[PDB]
Amino acid sequence: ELFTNNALNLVIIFGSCAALILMSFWFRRGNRKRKGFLFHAVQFLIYTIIISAVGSIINYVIENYKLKFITPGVIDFICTSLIAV
Amino acid sequence: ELFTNNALNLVIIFGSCAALILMSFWFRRGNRKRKGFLFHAVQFLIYTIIISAVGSIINYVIENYKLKFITPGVIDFICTSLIAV
């Protein structure tokens, strides 16, 4: 249920909220409007974290609930493919 | 409880106290005020020890008590990331 999902989510929702806060800060680029090189790189890094969090979610969704026929191999492959892209 | 936590902590608290004593000694730099190069390096080393001690703690906190959803992989990854940083 909702309570079980929130409990098993752990700090994945916290990680997503932190990523959203980081994106909001990047909207002003921290202090003044300036982007380029490293400003992108760190963003890429945090993007990976989000995907990792998503992975955890798409784990616990299929762990406590019905296993279905998704398997973790294809989802981790998709995560790596998105990161590379 | 407090007694169980103190027992399972072992010498981790002792390691933290030794690290605090080393930091206090470094405040006077041993004998006279002088810092540079090696004075930092050894400090870095002891810093790692502290993190290791912290790891042990964040182990036994989630071992005897509720497992929760923290997992040891992310905490060791965070320890290594902090050491590298």
UniProtKB/Swiss-Prot annotation, chains A, B:
Residue ranges that the UniProt entry lists as topological domain Periplasmic: 1-6, 59-74
Location relative to the cell: Cell inner membrane
Positions of transmembrane segments: 7-27, 38-58
Coiled coil: none
Cytoplasmic side: 28-37
Role this protein plays: Mechanosensitive channel that protects cells against hypoosmotic stress when highly overexpressed.
Similarity annotation: Belongs to the MscS (TC 1.A.23) family.
Subunit (UniProt): Homoheptamer.
Protein name stated in the entry: Low conductance mechanosensitive channel YnaI
Parent-protein start and end of this portion: 4 to 88 of 343
